Structures are given as C-alpha cells and as structure tokens.
Design a protein around this nucleic acid. Structure first.
Ligand SMILES: [K+]
Ligand SMILES: [Mg+2]
Ligand SMILES: [Mg+2]
Ligand SMILES: [Mg+2]
Ligand SMILES: [Mg+2]
Ligand SMILES: [Mg+2]
Ligand SMILES: [Mg+2]
Ligand SMILES: [Mg+2]
Ligand SMILES: [Mg+2]
Ligand SMILES: [Mg+2]
Ligand SMILES: [Mg+2]
Ligand SMILES: [Mg+2]
Ligand SMILES: [Mg+2]
Lengths: 127, 83, 100, 99, 115, 212, 155
RNA sequence: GGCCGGGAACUCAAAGGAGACUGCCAGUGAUAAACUGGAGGAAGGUGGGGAUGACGUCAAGUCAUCAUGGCCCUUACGACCAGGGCUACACACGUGCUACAAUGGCGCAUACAAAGAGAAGCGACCUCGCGAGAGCAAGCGGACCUCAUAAAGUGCGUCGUAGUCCGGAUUGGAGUCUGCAACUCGACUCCAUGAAGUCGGAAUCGCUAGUAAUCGUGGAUCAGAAUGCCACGGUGAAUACGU
RNA sequence: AGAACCUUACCUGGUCUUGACAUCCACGGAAGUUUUCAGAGAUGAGAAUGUGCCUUCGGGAACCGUGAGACAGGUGCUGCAU
C-alpha cells in the first residue's frame, strides 16, 4: 500500500507517499527537475534513495508547502526517510548513521529588542 | 501640487477683498495673512502685503506670478551668512 | 498635558461631530467629476468658510488618562506608560507579557 | 439551514467551558452538533517603551491571544434555538449566532 | 551618425546611442525607435542612411539639445529674476525642493569649504 | 536594578486579571475608560472602607462589579442603602445596567493593598515608619503569611535626603512564577512629599496553575 | 575560545562530483548567501579548466591545491619592544582553507571578464606554478625561512 | 478548478497529554559530586530562543507622561486665534540608506514564503489612464474576502570593464493623492536632467549558526507623511590552534 | 509608535480676564437649528426659528449666558526635596 512519511524543515512541511513501483518522482503535480531547478536540492531529494540503493524501485508522490527551495527539499528528504522507515524499518540504522532521521530543529531566530537582527547589534561608539 | 480636478485654491477673505479692490480701483496695499492662496489674473497690477511671520511684505503682482502662492514672494527666514 | 489642551481636543471632536455630514457632502460634490464647475467652486468656498476645528484631520490622539499626545495606542486609548501601568495591574483583559 | 456559533475569548479555559456547555445543551435537547473546531487564535502584539524618558532599547512586549472556537448545528429544531439564546454564557466570552 | 547637432556613438546599440542627446532618455529613444520601425538592438553603424534620415526626422519633433538648454535656462532665469523662494534658492545655490541644509546639501553646495 | 511587576509577570499563571470582559478593537478603549472611571469613583468613595481589589466583568449589556473589601458592613450599609446608590452611580457612569457584588477578605493583614494602605495612613498620621513597617511585617508573619517584604521610600521622617528602607521575614521568592506573591503599592502624601510603600506577601507556592 | 570546544559542522558534498573539498571552495567563494551562483561559477570554471588542462576536474583542482597549500606560516608575537614572526607548522584543514581562500582572493584581484574566467585562469596558473596565490605561498615560506630561528627557540 | 459528491487518512488548526531525567551503559575520580565517550531517541546533558535583573553603585535619567514638598506668576509665566518656526546652514560628529558594479545592470518568462492588518476600514473584478491614480463596485468585522501575482533564485538574451546600459544626487516642465490648506514644508508618478563616487587615512564596529551577510514582506504611530523602530519569513557562510 | 494647520510647549501680531478646563451663589433664558454682515481668525453685531422632559401648581433636572469672589489655570523653577 501507500507508506506515508511527514518531513519538516524550517517552515516547510512535506507529505511523502511511497509505493513499490517504477522510479517516478512527482512533487506538487510536477517532476523533480520541473519543481526543483536547484541541482543541490535534487541531490538532497535523491539522498535517502542512494544509500538504500533503491533509486528506481519506488514511486514517490510528494505534496510540500511552506518555506523556500532548500527548506522544501530538506523536508522532502526527511519525509522520504520517515516513509522508508515506515515501509521497511531495517533502514533505520543506515538512515540514522547518515543523519536523515533527525529533524533539523534549526529555525529562524527571532528579531530582538535593541538589535537590528536576531544578534546584530547596532554600531557602537564610545564617544 | 493641488489636483486640477479640484481647481486652484484661494482664501475667500482675499478673493472677496481683491474683487472689491479691482471693482473700486483700490491702490492701497492688500493686507493679508493668506500665503496659501494661488495668484489669479485679477490681482494683476495690485500690491499684496502678504504676511511672513512678523511683518507684511508688499509684493506687486506682475504677469509672471500667476499660478504661484502668495507666500513664495514673502521669505519667512532671515539669513545673511554665517561669518 | 494641560487642561487647555484637553479642552482643545474635546472641542475639536465636538465640532467634527457637529459638522461631519455637511462637509462630507461638500467634499463629495467637490470630488464629483459630473458636477458643474461653478458648483464645485462654490463648494470649495463653502468648505473654506466651514470651521477648521471641525476637520477630523486636526484631532491629535491623546491618552485618555493623562492627555499625552505621544506614544498613543488606538487599541487601549492610552499612552504607553498608562498601558504598562494598567497591564501590570491587570486592568486590561487578556494582556500579558509575551515571549516567543 | 444551519446554526453557526462563533466563540471569542481571551482565555482558552473558559472558552472550552462555554463550548462544552453549549454542546452539552444541544446534545441534551433534541439536536446534534458537529464537534467544536478550534480556529487560529489571533496574537495581537504590542511593544511599549517602559521608561518615561529616553531608554529606547528598554521595551515590554505584550500580547492578547484571541481564541476562537466554531460550533455547527446542522438541524435547528424549534426548541434548541430558543435554548441557545436563552442560555447564559461566561462574562468574558463573545458568542455570535448566525442563522 | 549626426542626429540633431551632435555626434551619436556608432559602436553602440540604437537606444543607448540615441540617449546621448540632451533631451532624449531611454523611453523617449525607445519611442523614437518604435516609430521608426528599427530594432533597438541593431547598431547605428549597421543601418542605412535612410534610416538615419528618418531617425533625425522624428528626433526633430522633440525639443532637444540647445533649444532645451535655452528653455531650461529660461525657466531657471525666470525663477531667479522673479525672486520667489525657488528663485532665491537657485541664486544662493541651496537646495530648492525642501531638502535639509544642516547636513547633506553637498550636490547643490559643491565641495566642503572649511572655515 | 529594576524588578518586573510580580502581579503582571504572574498574570495567567497564578494571578487572575482584575478585568474579565471581551471586546473588539471598536469597544476596547471605551470599556477601559469606563473601567478606569468606575474604579476611580469607587476608590474615592470607599477610601475609608478598606477596599483591596475592584474586579470588573462586563457581560452582554451589563456590568458586574465585585468589591473585595475588609469592611463589608460599612461597604453595604444599613439595609444595603449605600451599595444601592453605588450601583446607581456605577450604572450612570458606565452607561449600562450594573450589579455590585461584595466579597469579604478574612485576613486584612495578608492582603498587600490593605497593608500598604494602613502603612500609608499611618505615615500621613505621622507614626514612625520603622514602627509601622515592623507592625505590618509581624502581623502578617503571625497570621500565616509564608513571607512578607515591606519597602518604604522617600524622605523618611521628614529627612531632606530620601532613603529606601525595607524589612523582610520568611521567603519572598520573586523569581518563582508559580509562587503566590500578592504585591501592591500605596502612596502617602505627607507635608514633606510623597512616601512610596510597596508590599509583597508570599502565601505559598501554587501547584496546578490557573485551575487552582 | 576559552572553555567550550567546537563540534564540526557537517557540510554537504557538492552535487556534481560528491566533493566536500569543492563544497568548501564554493562556500569560501560564496557571497551574501548566493550558493547557487557560487556553484555555477565553480562548475563553469572547473569545466573550462578541465577542457584546458586535459585531466579531470578533481585531479586538476587537487594539483592546484597542492601548489598553494602552505606548510609553515608566521604568527606575530610581541617580545619586549620588538615583534618576532614565529614560524609554525599548520594543520591539513588550515592548509586547505588557506589555499582555497588565497585562490579566491587572487581570482578576485584578477582582471578578466567573469569570475569563472578569473577562477579558471587562477587554477591554471596554480597548476603551472605561478601567479598571485603561488606568490603568496612563496612570500609566506620566505618569511618563515627567514625567521626560522625564532620558532627554533620557541620549541 | 478540491471543482463536485464525498472521506477524517495527511498537511494544518488548538486543546489535553507523552517525551529529556546524566534516565541507561563503559572508563576517570576520593566507595562522592562530577567529567569524557557510547547506545537509544526527533531532540543529550542548560536541545535552540525569550520572559525573568539579587544587596547595592552612578545625588545616573525623567518635576515636559503622571503624581508630589517647596518656590514663583495671577488683566499673566494663564487662555484663544492667524501667520511663521521647530525643516535655517561657512562647519564638526554619531546612526542609517544607496552605491562605486559583470557573484552585476537591464529586458522577457517563471518557481518557492512566514507572520500580520482591516468598518469615518481592507477594498477585489471590470472600464479609463504611460504611470501615480480615477470611476463603477463584489466580498469581508475575516483559516472564507481584501491588503497581496514575495524578492534574491532559475532559464534565455544583451551590455564587455567604460564614470559605462554602473550610480541616481540635483534641477526644469507636466501631474496624482490625502487634507480647510502641500510657498516655507508631504509622499508618489511621468518626461527630460544625469552630480559625487572606481572599495575609502589615522582609527573603529558587529557577529560563533540558521548566526553574519543579504533578499523581500507586514505592523504600530498614522487624514497624508519611513532609509527609523518593532516583527516576519527566503537564501545562507567563514572561522575559533588557543588564553 | 511619525512638526504643512492641528500637535506646539517657541516667535510676531491681534484678542480675553472667575477665565479655555471645574465646583459653589444669585439672576435671566429650554437647549438645539437655519442664516446675514465685518474681521486673517479669534470675535462682535444681528435676523429668522424652536420652546422639549418630570413633578407639582410652587418649581425643578439638563443646557446656555451675565455678575461677584472662593478659586481655576501654569509643558514656569528645583530629578541635588520626592
Ligand atoms: K527617581
Ligand atoms: Mg532575517
Ligand atoms: Mg495628526
Ligand atoms: Mg550521546
Ligand atoms: Mg531564573
Ligand atoms: Mg543628577
Ligand atoms: Mg498656532
Ligand atoms: Mg546577465
Ligand atoms: Mg541604471
Ligand atoms: Mg486577522
Ligand atoms: Mg569623478
Ligand atoms: Mg505649528
Ligand atoms: Mg537622581
């Protein structure tokens, strides 16, 4: 059946459905090369299907929302990793040693009082 | 500048006082505080003593001032160099 | 602020509420593109003769406890100092110190 | 036709009390409801200078959280509507009924 | 090429080549090229003398170069001779359109004059 | 340095609000001005009646004012003839039907508004400030308070240089947000100027949160 | 710094060659967070370099890195009323870092048309053992071989 | 066209819980506290960030938020009005913004946000205007409608190292909007103008990771008037041997 | 957390003196509305219109104006009295 994963990265959420199939990848009613023009974003999408050596063995149906290009691609990678763990569950050790089971908890630090940015203090003059 | 769909602006007290002046041939200066009023072609030939903050500067109206406010010819700030 | 300044703000609010409707229709027939030019012109003259303090643009939002013309908030009707004081005393419902 | 009740409050606990009270009322009387949907709460933030003079980097950050809960009644019988606007809800709760 | 009274740079594309006229910028040049029916990417050196002639002929309805310098001088001279606020700012070399002179009036006032 | 207000930092944790109505943006400033007006009137009217907190609720086309006081007998009056006239003046000041409920505090030496008000009235009646602060502190520690701090500031005893003096017994854990610290303040208007009184009373930590 | 020890941040190998070395070189060349345009600059420069050199991209980039990589740098130390430049052997990760920053700074100081052409010329000159980055290595090694006595004593 | 019947799985929303405690394991230690490493786990040792500021110091700031002792004025130091000033300008400094360009300028096409606001308000769609904007007017007190097709990016083309197709100051003319009123002294638009500037002396500032750098977006104040402030996402580094 | 007027505390000039903002006393008018002239406006002189609510049959409440003095007012000074 359809093995499901949720991935999240920054502001992006990715719903990933895994079906044993030919090797198709569809993200938001578009292919991987149509949706992600960034070749490093395509690389991190194909990253969990490289150590498992199942690049052309599953059909990937992905709906993603929020965030930008690399955030969406990282959320898609986390969703592929989760759904692969739902589908097999022995890939847990290899995906953990690669570091894809971990949700990257790095969010945008808030803009604070008295700083121009999250940490950027304005220019200081003793006199 | 003010929109053309709303016309030009002139203060009534001045408009009525310059209609009276151009009707009676008044040659005394038109004393006013209304620096925001646009010069119309019926002030031509009259002198208008427009306020600037502390005295009324008299400006004689020529053909070239039509479409300008009264306050452009009364300088408010006094400056005579620094050193 | 001064009692004279609070009285000025009250008188401007009262004059705006008194002359709100006729200035609105005066501005409507000034900005109407189908109106005649003499009508628009006489309406400009009538807007001029209408009192200046009756114009809603002349109101300065003051704190309703002190009269402060700076640091206003429209939600609480108060200056920032009285907003902080009433927020700490808990007289403003739902307002607490935020962190995220 | 259907009864739409929107519930607004500053605190979530008494708005849960009010929404549980009206769904019990409409489940006690002859009607059925469509569970209370928790709709996104509005966090209106304020930043206020805390010094009476100068000190611009000294500020308090305030927030009002306006919780909203929506409850549906798909079949308004002749007594549940009268019980709805006869029911007494909490003091800091706004209840809007649309027909 | 010699359009109006000055020399147009031959090595550049028509649009920019035409912007080299006092009175013609980018959109006025575009309008000139679009009314002449010549691409803006073609170099002026790679187009015929009839195209040069009609480029001259429809540059000629835009008051430009020395006539525009005469009109601009006449407007500024009318302000200065009239003696309004804009006239006194033009006479004293100060900013005319309400900018600050406590700092940063350097374009109108020239380089810095130490006391 | 400067300390945060211990009631405002605990609002929504262990301390409830003094105003519990809902309004939109359209009615918020009007409701806050009405609440300020009725609280100012009730404070000026019952300055001699030992009022600690005036809680205002505004339900649908009504206002309910709960007066937590230490002397509800003189607050209510003879056959409630006074609280009826209070309800009348509160109604024609808020501009809406009013109901006034009277809550009685049982320990007036454990509520920080009444303690600071008693210290202020003693300072206007020219008792020694050390004696007033030590009495208030000893009354609270004897009647149960898990702690009290009393701070009194500004021209103490008519001195030309203002001082801040404070006494504290027991725990006053001001950084513990779950700690039920009741804090209030008063101002004595003496002939040498204003003397500010701050009172913190710790009544034990609250486990459970706002539901308790 | 003083107390804490820094864990190493994982960088992703580049998508064309799988090289963390070229990933660092992109990031070193990156500006204002534009890694795409940075990757396009290194990819076009590596393509023209590889066409020009003959061997592969990672072999020619590695032989350029072996020609700017320093082995000894001079640290500044104040001894009394004078300064000693004291020679110190450097770690391999700093060798790579210093080499890639000197390549990026030399190709930024060059005067070709595009950054990819500047970088390709700098990598070709580095493979041919000349240019600004190799001269910076020779100046650093000249200062170290001049002041080797100070390091001698320091040990 | 989630467009429709539908479904409650998913995203998400907002309530309640669970989870992280040096809890387990192995070394070091003084049979201790604790340290280091490992497993498991989404997160590991304070997981990240905020709120939270001890006794006191500087007779620090505020009598112009407010309150207040004292002093001073009371046909004036109080009050009202019109106009002006707070916007001046030989100069000096602080804090920003935009640049000096090719990691870019421009033109066409196209992808991906997060937070927020709205009734004397946000104002679609259609028509007109080169544009600012105008007319008609739907929806929305809002997970609905509107503000509001995000930009950097990507793809194609062009410019070819020049004070330039860089830059956008200044100025002339023509306008739009708001407001009684845009001269002093508003913002914006169009057309023309096209200033300095080619990376900055001594010196000096910020920042250890989703940070710096940059790229847009929203809010308060507000009739109008942000390069300021407050907040929000997108891309996203380098470096820390060491005291 | 936003000076074109307003804000505004400053200047010039024109104006008011129990006062712009209150409470208290006495007298007279319900308030409110429309409109003319002069003045830069403040303001002053008018014209026309309206006479409402509750008692009680004597007057009240709201509001306006006049007159007197208790005062009102002060973003005036001292943050080194607070
Ligand atoms: K103080
Ligand atoms: Mg950011
Ligand atoms: Mg204003
Ligand atoms: Mg571990
Ligand atoms: Mg703590
Ligand atoms: Mg001092
Ligand atoms: Mg004035
Ligand atoms: Mg290009
Ligand atoms: Mg340009
Ligand atoms: Mg909303
Ligand atoms: Mg130059
Ligand atoms: Mg002013
Ligand atoms: Mg002090």
């Amino acid at each position: 059946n359809q093995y499901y994963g949720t991935g999240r990265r920054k502001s992006s959420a990715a719903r990933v459905f895994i079906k044993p199939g030919n090797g198709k990848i569809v993200i938001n009613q578009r292919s991987l090369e149509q949706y992600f023009g960034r070749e490093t974003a395509r690389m991190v999408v194909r990253q969990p299907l490289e150590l498992v050596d199942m690049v052309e063995k599953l059909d990937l149906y992905i709906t993603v929302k929020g965030g930008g290009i690399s955030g969406q691609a990282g959320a898609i990678r986390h969703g592929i990793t989760r759904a692969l763990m739902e589908y097999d569950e022995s890939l847990r050790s290899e995906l953990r040693k690669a570091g894809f089971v971990t949700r990257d908890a790095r969010q945008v630090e808030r803009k604070k009082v008295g700083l121009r940015k999250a940490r950027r203090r304005p220019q200081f003059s003793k006199r | 500048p003010r929109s053309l769909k709303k016309g030009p602006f002139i203060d009534l007290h001045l408009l009525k006082k310059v209609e009276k002046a151009v009707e009676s041939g008044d040659k005394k200066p038109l004393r006013t505080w209304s620096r925001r009023s646009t010069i119309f072609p019926n002030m031509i030939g009259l002198t208008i003593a427009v306020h600037n903050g502390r005295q009324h500067v008299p400006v004689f109206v020529t053909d070239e001032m039509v479409g300008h406010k009264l306050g452009e010819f009364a300088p408010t700030r006094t400056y005579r160099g620094h050193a | 602020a001064k009692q004279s300044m609070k009285a000025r703000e009250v008188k401007r609010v009262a004059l705006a509420d008194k002359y709100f409707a006729k200035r609105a229709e005066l501005k409507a027939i000034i900005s109407d593109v189908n109106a005649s030019d003499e009508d628009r012109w006489n309406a400009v003259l009538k807007l001029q003769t209408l009192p200046r303090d009756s114009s809603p643009s002349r109101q300065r939002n003051r704190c309703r406890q002190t009269g402060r013309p700076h640091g206003f908030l429209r939600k609480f009707g108060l200056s920032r100092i009285k907003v902080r004081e009433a927020a700490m005393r808990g007289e403003i419902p739902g307002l607490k110190k935020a962190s995220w | 036709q259907r009864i739409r009740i929107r519930l607004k409050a500053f605190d979530h606990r008494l708005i849960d009390q009010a929404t549980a009270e009206i769904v019990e009322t409409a489940k006690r009387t002859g009607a059925q409801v469509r569970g209370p949907i928790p709709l996104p709460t509005r966090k209106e933030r304020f930043t206020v200078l805390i010094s009476p003079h100068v000190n611009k980097d000294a500020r308090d950050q305030y927030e009002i959280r306006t919780h909203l809960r929506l409850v549906d009644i798909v079949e308004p019988t002749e007594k549940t509507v009268d019980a709805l606007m006869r029911l007494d809800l909490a003091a800091g709760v706004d209840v809007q009924i649309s027909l | 090429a010699r359009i109006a009274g000055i020399n147009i740079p031959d090595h550049k594309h028509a649009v920019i080549a035409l912007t080299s006229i006092y009175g013609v910028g980018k959109t006025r040049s575009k309008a000139i090229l679009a009314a002449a029916g010549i691409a803006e990417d073609v170099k002026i050196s790679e187009l015929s003398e009839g195209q040069i002639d009609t480029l001259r002929d429809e540059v000629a309805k835009f008051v430009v170069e020395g006539d525009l310098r005469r009109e601009i001088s006449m407007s500024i001279k009318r302000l200065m001779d009239l003696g309004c606020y804009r006239g006194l700012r033009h006479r004293r070399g100060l900013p005319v359109r309400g900018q600050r002179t406590k700092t940063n009036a350097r374009t109108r006032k020239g380089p810095r004059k130490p006391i | 340095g400067q300390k945060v207000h211990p009631n405002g930092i605990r609002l929504g944790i262990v301390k409830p609000w003094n105003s519990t109505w809902f309004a939109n943006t359209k009615e918020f400033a009007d409701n806050l001005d009405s609440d300020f007006k009725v609280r100012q009137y009730l404070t000026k009217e019952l300055a001699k009646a030992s009022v600690s907190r005036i809680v205002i609720e505004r339900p649908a086309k009504s206002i309910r004012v709960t007066i937590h006081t230490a002397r509800p007998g003189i607050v209510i009056g003879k056959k409630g003839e006074d609280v009826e006239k209070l309800r009348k003046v509160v109604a024609d000041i808020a501009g809406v039907p009013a109901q006034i409920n009277i809550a009685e505090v049982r320990k007036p030496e454990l509520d920080a508004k009444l303690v600071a008000d008693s210290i202020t009235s003693q300072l206007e009646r020219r008792v020694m400030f050390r004696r007033a602060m030590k009495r208030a502190v000893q009354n609270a520690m004897r009647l149960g308070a898990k702690g009290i701090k009393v701070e009194v500031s500004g021209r103490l005893g008519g001195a030309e240089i203002a001082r801040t003096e404070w006494y504290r017994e027991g725990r006053v854990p001001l950084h513990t947000l779950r700690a039920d610290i009741d804090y209030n303040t008063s101002e004595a208007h003496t002939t040498y100027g204003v003397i500010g009184v701050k009172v913190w009373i710790f009544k034990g930590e609250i486990l459970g949160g706002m539901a308790a | 710094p003083r107390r804490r020890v820094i864990g190493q941040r994982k960088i992703l190998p580049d998508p064309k060659f799988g090289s963390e070395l070229l990933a660092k070189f992109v990031n070193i060349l990156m500006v204002d967070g534009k890694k795409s345009t940075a990757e396009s600059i290194v990819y076009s420069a590596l393509e023209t370099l590889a066409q020009r050199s003959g061997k592969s991209e990672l072999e020619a980039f590695e032989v350029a890195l072996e020609n700017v990589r320093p082995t000894v740098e001079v640290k500044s130390r104040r001894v009394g009323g004078s300064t000693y430049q004291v020679p110190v052997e450097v770690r391999p990760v700093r060798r790579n870092a210093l080499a890639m920053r000197w390549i990026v700074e030399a190709a930024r100081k060059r005067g070709d048309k595009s950054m990819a052409l500047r970088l390709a010329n700098e990598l070709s000159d580095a493979a041919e053992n000349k240019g600004t980055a190799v001269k910076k290595r020779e100046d650093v090694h000249r200062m170290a071989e001049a002041n080797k006595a100070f390091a001698h004593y320091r040990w």
